[PDB]
């Protein structure tokens, strides 16, 4: 925002919303940051606003400046003797003696290479995720397996709206696992009271790289469902929208986001 007001030369003043969190069309009435811009008590709303079709009909969203989505985070789980004689050499006449010694030489190369290669095997050990993705059998059939599973999300958000409109039963299951904050979900997951937490992709990446240790991870190497963007809410049909977005494109071309994201969005865990 400091970069924004610099080039278009507009004055402003901030204040905090008191009713709602991010916007919820209740009885046809929107609240939060979006609700005010509909009422035009404010001309711009800036923060963590998720671009979706439903919210694009009451306000206008400028070009997104950061890419995010919907993700799920889980805690990282922590003649008879002739064969006999030749058989012992591998497990550590004159011509008969010669055959034994050369066989021992082969055995030594066999055993020495066996231990050295085995040592390298434990060097590159890895782990795998327990769930394929959002369409997992334990997800589409929650609490339908020998071990009852548990997972939920914060209500009154964009992510909750998306779930209800694509998986009704899956949305209905999560009603008893609703959280109220980022920290509460992280701690409950740490305490084992919860098994999986679904929330915004951009912020859960931040918490993963800044958690105490690296106990909490996201599914896969980073998987995003329903890619979208974060946007700036503007009053409907504003004359600034042409100039508002043109500045954002100047930012990516020059490259200020790289430095800014390293300042705020960098992490510790890898």
């Amino acid at each position: 925002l400091k970069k924004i007001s610099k080039s278009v030369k507009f004055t402003y003043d901030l204040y905090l919303v008191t009713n709602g969190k991010h916007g919820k069309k209740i009885n046809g009435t929107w609240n939060g940051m979006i609700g005010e811009v509909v009422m035009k008590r404010a001309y711009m709303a800036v923060g963590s606003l998720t671009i979706n079709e439903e919210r694009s009909e009451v306000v206008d969203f400028s070009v997104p400046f950061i890419e995010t989505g919907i993700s799920v985070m889980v805690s990282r789980s922590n003649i008879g003797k002739a064969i006999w004689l030749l058989w012992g050499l591998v497990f550590n006449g004159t011509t008969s003696k010669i055959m034994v010694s050369v066989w021992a030489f082969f055995a030594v190369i066999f055993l020495a290479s066996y231990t050295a290669n085995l040592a390298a095997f434990m060097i590159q050990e890895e782990y795998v995720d327990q769930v394929s993705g959002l369409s997992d059998k334990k997800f589409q059939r929650p609490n339908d397996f020998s071990p009852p599973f548990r997972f939920g999300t914060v209500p009154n958000g964009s992510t909750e709206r998306n779930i209800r409109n694509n998986y009704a039963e899956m949305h209905a299951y999560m009603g008893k696992f609703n959280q109220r904050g980022v920290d509460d979900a992280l701690l409950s997951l740490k305490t084992g009271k919860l098994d999986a937490f679904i929330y915004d992709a951009a912020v859960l990446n931040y918490m993963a790289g800044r958690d105490e240790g690296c106990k909490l991870v996201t599914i896969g190497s980073g998987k995003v469902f329903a890619s979208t963007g974060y946007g700036i809410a503007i009053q409907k049909d504003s004359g600034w929208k042409r100039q508002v977005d043109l500045a954002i494109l100047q930012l990516f071309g020059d490259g200020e986001m790289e430095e800014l994201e390293a300042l705020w969005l960098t992490g510790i865990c890898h």
């Binding site: 671009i51 979706n52 079709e53 694009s56 890419e67 003696k97 010669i98 010694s101 021992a104 030489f105 030594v108 020495a112 050295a116 040592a119 390298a120 998306n162 694509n166 329903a226 890619s227 979208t228 963007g229 043109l246 494109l249 100047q250 990516f252 071309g253 490259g255 790289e258």
Partner: protein, 221 residues
């Protein structure tokens, strides 16, 4: 202008649908919708004595030499283990900061990447090196680097990933920079914009993009 923008502004075209690189010059002359792609830029690269020596005064020497043989074979095991175990990285390569005739990095002539690198004069030497080896199409560069006539190729991430899936020798680098998107070029302010962007968003929201990736993007060779 020329190319896609040269044809679109001439009126012979109406709506450019292609992997269009969104930049600042294009937004001034023509309109866009929400980008349908998410990726950055990277590089494509190509990849009794017999029983003792082997196992009364002479017996002391024999046992000493047996110990010598044991320590010698232990040392040989140690050195073979050391032999078998112990013995560019993006734009930040100093050898690419000041290139030579050996490291050959090239890009597409009259493409958005060349303009992007010309914008930042801090890579003027790179702009002074790529000018001698700009190729018309990505296929030409891929074929030339497959013949090992090239050594690097600054290009999009998704295209080079599909190419690496096709050809196992194709390898990418580490750096992922300039995270832009691909969108649908349009004419000037027209009613073919609002519903177009709404349709693109409605396609992104559901599993349609995943299905299209199953068709072409997700698949590996």
């Amino acid at each position: 202008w020329n190319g896609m923008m040269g044809e679109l502004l001439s009126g012979q075209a109406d709506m450019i649908v292609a992997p269009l690189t969104i930049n600042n010059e294009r937004a001034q002359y023509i309109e866009f919708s929400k980008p349908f792609k998410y990726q950055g830029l990277t590089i494509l690269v190509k990849k009794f004595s017999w029983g003792v020596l082997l196992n009364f005064s002479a017996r002391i020497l024999g046992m000493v030499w047996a110990g010598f043989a044991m320590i010698i074979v232990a040392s040989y095991t140690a050195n073979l283990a050391a032999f078998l175990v112990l013995d560019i990285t993006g734009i930040n390569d100093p050898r690419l900061r000041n290139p030579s005739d050996k490291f050959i990095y090239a890009t597409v002539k009259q493409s958005s990447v060349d303009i992007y690198f010309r914008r930042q004069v801090e890579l003027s030497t790179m702009y002074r090196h790529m000018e001698k080896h700009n190729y018309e199409s990505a296929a030409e560069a891929i074929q030339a680097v497959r013949d090992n006539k090239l050594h690097a190729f600054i290009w999009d991430s998704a295209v080079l990933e599909f190419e690496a899936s096709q050809k196992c020798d194709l390898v990418t680098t580490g750096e992922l920079f300039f995270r832009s998107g691909f969108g649908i070029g349009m004419r000037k302010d027209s009613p073919w914009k609002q519903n177009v962007s709404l349709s693109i968003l409605k396609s992104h929201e559901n599993g349609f993009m995943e299905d299209l990736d199953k068709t072409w993007v997700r698949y590996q060779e």
